[PDB]
Amino acid sequence: ELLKPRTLADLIRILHELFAGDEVNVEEVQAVLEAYESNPAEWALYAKFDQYRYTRNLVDQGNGKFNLMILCWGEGHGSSIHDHTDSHCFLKLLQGNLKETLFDWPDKKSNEMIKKSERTLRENQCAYINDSIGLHRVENVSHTEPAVSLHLFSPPFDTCHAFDQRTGHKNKVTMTFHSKFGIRTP
Ligand SMILES: [Fe+3]
């Protein structure tokens, strides 16, 4: 029985129920994420920005089933084109807008990665991706508004691949946390 999360804490409690088992009902998880109405006071603790690039701020470890993190995107900050390491990725906007650009997996042949589509993800909207769907890039293209997003990865992963848009070549990247549970983690 899916109920509207009243607060971020309530959302987290609900997520623990939805990930209690070994599989993932993607549509239910996405629906509850989209039903949480972003309340900045509830997530201010995690919203730690860096001047030069986007930051990853761990919120909850999902009893081992998922990582829930808040990403803070300064103006013009964006990601690589990347995969999600055989995990589910849910991305909910908490503040601002993000451009999501979709790419297919490259062939072995070195070639330009041509975008398959793009969309603007707006406040409170929740997107979903996995490796079976493809790759994406996420960017805050705003010149005037920082963006904040809530990401759920299941299972948790700490590495992924970045893809060179010019060639399709991939490189392994280890993700780092800017903070965990509100505590800056150099
Ligand atoms: Fe992603």
UniProtKB/Swiss-Prot annotation:
Tissue specificity comment: Highest levels in liver. Significant expression also in kidney, lung and brain.
InterPro entries with a match to the protein in the record: CDO_1 (IPR010300), RmlC-like_jellyroll (IPR014710), RmlC_Cupin_sf (IPR011051)
Residue location of crosslink 3'-(S-cysteinyl)-tyrosine (Cys-Tyr): C89-F153
Induction of expression: By increase of sulfur amino acid intake.
SUPFAM superfamilies: RmlC-like cupins (SSF51182)
Record Pfam families: CDO_I (PF05995)
Record GO terms (molecular function): cysteine dioxygenase activity; ferrous iron binding; nickel cation binding; zinc ion binding
Range of residues in the leader sequence: none
Catalytic activity from the UniProt record: L-cysteine + O2 = 3-sulfino-L-alanine + H(+)
BP terms from Gene Ontology: cysteine metabolic process; L-cysteine catabolic process; L-cysteine metabolic process; lactation; response to amino acid; response to azide; response to cAMP; response to ethanol
Alphabetical UniProt keywords: Dioxygenase, Iron, Metal-binding, Oxidoreductase, Thioether bond
Cross-referenced Gene3D superfamilies: Jelly Rolls
This enzyme's EC code(s): 1.13.11.20
Cofactor: how and how many bound: Binds 1 Fe cation per subunit. Ni(2+) and Zn(2+) can be used to a lesser extent.
Cofactor: Fe cation; Ni(2+); Zn(2+)
Family: Belongs to the cysteine dioxygenase family.
Reported function: Catalyzes the oxidation of cysteine to cysteine sulfinic acid with addition of molecular dioxygen.
Subunit details: Monomer.
Record's protein name: Cysteine dioxygenase type 1
Provenance organism: Rattus norvegicus (Rat)
